[PDB]
Amino acid sequence: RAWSGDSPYHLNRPPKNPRGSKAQLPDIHPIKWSNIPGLESVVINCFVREARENQLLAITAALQLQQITGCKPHPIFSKNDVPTWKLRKGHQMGAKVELKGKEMSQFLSTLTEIVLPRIREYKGISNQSGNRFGGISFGLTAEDIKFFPEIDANQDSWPKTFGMHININTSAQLDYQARTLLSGFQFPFFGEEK
Amino acid sequence: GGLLWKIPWRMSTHQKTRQRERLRNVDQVIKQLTLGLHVQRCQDKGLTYQEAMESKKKYKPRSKSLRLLNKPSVFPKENQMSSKDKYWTFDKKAVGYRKGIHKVPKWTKISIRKAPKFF
Amino acid sequence: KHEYAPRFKIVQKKQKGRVPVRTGGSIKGSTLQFGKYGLRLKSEGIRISAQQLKEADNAIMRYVRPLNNGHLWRRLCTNVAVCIKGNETRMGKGKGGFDHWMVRVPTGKILFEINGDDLHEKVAREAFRKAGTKLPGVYEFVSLDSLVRVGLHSFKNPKDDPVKNFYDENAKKPSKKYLNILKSQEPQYKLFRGR
Amino acid sequence: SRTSMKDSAGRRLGPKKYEGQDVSTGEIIMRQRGTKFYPGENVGIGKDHSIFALEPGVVRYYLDPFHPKRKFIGVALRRDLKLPSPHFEPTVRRFGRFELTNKRAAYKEENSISR
RNA sequence: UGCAAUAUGAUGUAAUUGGUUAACAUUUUAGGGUCAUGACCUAAUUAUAUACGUUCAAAUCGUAUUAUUGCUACCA
RNA sequence: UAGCCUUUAUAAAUAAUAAUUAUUAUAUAAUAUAUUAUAUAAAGAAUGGUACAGCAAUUAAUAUAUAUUAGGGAACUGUUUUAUUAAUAAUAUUAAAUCUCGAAAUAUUUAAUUAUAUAUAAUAAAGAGUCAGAUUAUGUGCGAUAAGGUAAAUAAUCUAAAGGGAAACAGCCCAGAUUAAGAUAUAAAGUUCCUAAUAAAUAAUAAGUGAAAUAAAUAUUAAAAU
RNA sequence: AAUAUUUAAAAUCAAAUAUAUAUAUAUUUGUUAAUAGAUAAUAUACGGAUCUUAAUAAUAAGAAUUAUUUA
RNA sequence: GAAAGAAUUAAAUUAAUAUAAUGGUAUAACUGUGCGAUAAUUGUAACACAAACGAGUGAAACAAGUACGUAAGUAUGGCAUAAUGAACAAAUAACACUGAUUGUAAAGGUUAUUGAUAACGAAUAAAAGUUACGCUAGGGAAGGGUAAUAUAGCGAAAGAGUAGAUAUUGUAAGCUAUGUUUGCCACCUUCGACUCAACAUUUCCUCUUGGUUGUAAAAGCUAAGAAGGGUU
């Protein structure tokens, strides 16, 4: 918000912060042919907290992300320091992979085809989830990852399995556009919207 | 404050007359300084001394100091000042925020014509 | 709640300083902005401690409390901290320990404000008069129709103060830096920056 | 009682050469902490961010439109020269070095080569 | 800066012309004990300091790594 | 030792001091939206961040039947709401030695010109004394916005300064003693007498207030304007 | 006349001045008094005397206080 | 109409900077990366800032060599301001400069480096107290100013006073007066008793008077005028 000119102190004053937020928010354009909500990337976040003691377990995360997603996993190292959690800064604990294009499409398909329709109490993705401007996230527990074809085939070589975070980025301007979009790719929703 | 500097807080009628005269003298010095510049410029244009004094147009000074000294707002003339400003000065550590002008060092020579608008 | 007890994280033994004499004729803090009646200083600038303001406040509240929707606004904060050594000490040995808080109130600053659905304009005048007897200056009574005081004997009505935009005024008399900034956007300078 | 009397003597900073002054090579035209004034033309800068002239001339304080929000100090090669020199004009250089007319001096210099 | 000596159980002590993780001892129990105490029997200890060559062969020799204490050179 | 003083001199010496022009804009005319001349206005070439002014960011303070989160009782009858409180958001109002988004005057300082030349700077050779300061005025640190207090900053005087004035008076207002005279101007200060010198105009005071060192909050009486 | 506020040249009004000049703009100046409160030690202490006016009536006095001025 | 690129504009120095605070930094001085390990080199250093001297700071330029970069060019340590110590006497090495009759040598000299005088311009390699038994040369290198404190008054009145703030009492804050107590500055280097007292009144008694649902009388409380006499 610009400074109204009524005093000789506004000439070089930096502008005020937005009304209710400390960060500027983007504009929302009407949907047209050029801009139609569509997918752009999918990011898998895996933070093995137990790696604080056994670092060797973090490697198993990279393998798990590799086998499932099929792309090279970029590792995740600590950044903060919480003594209450025995958390130390500068240690490897997990891996992440950026998925785009066809490989992301395969992941999304195999997630809804195989892994998702195998949880006993599954109801869908919460309608409350999602960044205000596009982007939807959910999470898979430790036991859900056993449902992937590449772990089910070699259960012997996968003694330990553990959950991860999923984030689907899309060209949707707002969340509700994304939810309608993702529903076309066989994604269920259960909660009540905002 | 044992030592006695018996300086009164008010002026006598005779000190006031002299103060008014001193202010007038300073104004007359300023009035004469401008007059010389006007006459000198007129002589430069070709005029003579007599017609320069009788010229309807009076060339105003161009120097910053003389231009401001001729502004009544900046340097008021004796007939334009208030009685308070003639005899009283502004001190921020005095009751009434004013003190006798005669208490200013070298008041006879120094010139203090302007005081803050509301003080 | 902390008007007379500021919560500075780090305590500092502030200098003595001097009570400002607003030579520029500023009216900031000298106008009613929260209530219907108020109290302000008439004499020269002075410093008021927390104890004096606390006790002046108690006098006013003695009349605000027996009222409906009665509010008292405190326009003054005891920002300055003053330290006083004991009398029985030689001069020197640094600065003494903190004792209380002060506030520098210029000639015409408003200290309190009152409002209520039934004030009658008489209890307000009595309350402020009594509260003034506990403070170290001379004060009077202000209302929405009262003129704003700017000096010991001079008054001013803020409505007559002109209103002007300064962005356009700057363009009328631009500064050297502003001209350079405007001149930098020119194509013969923006297209050859090399950045 | 314990009192803090430890205070460093002030550093004699500030402009040591004002606008219009005629300077020589290496003269310090400003000692400042940080770069409050950036170097301009025919002038250098040192470890202490001290600005010093590189060629004889006249010191001028100016603002370059290429670098808004940046004051400058330079050394115009001549009094009648405005320092923010036009961008697309040949730079004003100074040869400075003189010709060796003496025969012996010329002979020595011609027969003087790098190792 | 140079030099020398220690440093065994958790307890404080062994001891060595190498060829031993040895006992008193501390704690947990057991047994006789009307009941105890006091005896006798067990169970854990020693990184008998740090880490490597010669030695059937290394805590018994010195190096590399250490923790403590002392005597020396500089001392403007 | 430097700083402040003195003696003698050197020119390829004015380099010293002081001020003006510089800059922006308006109006008129000439020249090819620009240049020149003339007049006028503007705190007027370059550097700065004090007063003032302000609440920008930082540090603090106040209020909202405003909104959200969480806490708790009641109502509803476990729900939501209400009673609220702390925090944040929004609006409005404030201040500060170590805040300056705005910003003076003084100040630092530059080239040319002009004026001071019975005048300044610089330089060379030789001599000192001083290194306990005081008051007044202004802006401050300490003290208690106390001290004929203490510590610094700027200017003047005393120190080392006669004379006039403040009754008397080192430091305040004038004014600087070569020796005479005493005609004329006078500075500060005064003119009923002591005591050198006066007559007036318009209002107020009735208290000897006051008349050459103003004592406050408040109360009473009266006078103007709304 | 009674009652309640302030004692103000900021705003308004009046007047003066500089520019375009019968007008307008700009600048400058103009807004209460007395008393009580009232205070210690050799002796009243404006330096002292003393200073407020009065027609009948003098050649002739009528602040020597405060505020703004003149010659 | 669409996709990609070059990017531009606004905001930002609040993060980060080896280390305190301040100034600077996005054109980054901050971060990542390749080469590198080079300039964390060598002899002359004019000229300036600062400055009593000793010292300290920036650095153009000439010459030898090195690293990076296609090149232009950059590098004489760290974004800048702290991270320090004189001589004397000793110690180590290099130069080839003297070599006390000559030749060597010894010893000194030039160049480079070493060790702390922290009272940090460092009086020695090496030094604490007592004196009322004291001594010499010097300087002051109760009065006065102030009134925090103390005493007293004034303004307003919270609250007691059977009722009612103002018969009497009067929290805490405010405005003053005195210099009678405890202090502060340094212009100025004897408590008590006996005898005699003089002066002030902020009056203890005596004289006149106002108030006192708290003046029935008498005793009393408070206050005004009053310093003539008296006050173990």
Ligand SMILES: [Mg+2]
């Ligand atoms: Mg202020």
Ligand SMILES: [Mg+2]
């Ligand atoms: Mg400093």
Ligand SMILES: [Mg+2]
């Ligand atoms: Mg000397």
Ligand SMILES: [Mg+2]
């Ligand atoms: Mg000259």
Ligand SMILES: [Mg+2]
């Ligand atoms: Mg300051």
Ligand SMILES: [Mg+2]
């Ligand atoms: Mg600024």
Ligand SMILES: [Mg+2]
């Ligand atoms: Mg001295």
Ligand SMILES: [Mg+2]
């Ligand atoms: Mg003194």
Ligand SMILES: [Mg+2]
């Ligand atoms: Mg002397």
Ligand SMILES: [Mg+2]
């Ligand atoms: Mg004299």
Ligand SMILES: [Mg+2]
């Ligand atoms: Mg003199």
Ligand SMILES: [Mg+2]
């Ligand atoms: Mg003379």
Ligand SMILES: [Mg+2]
């Ligand atoms: Mg009198």
Ligand SMILES: [Mg+2]
């Ligand atoms: Mg007299």
Ligand SMILES: [Mg+2]
């Ligand atoms: Mg006016």
Ligand SMILES: [Mg+2]
């Ligand atoms: Mg007397």
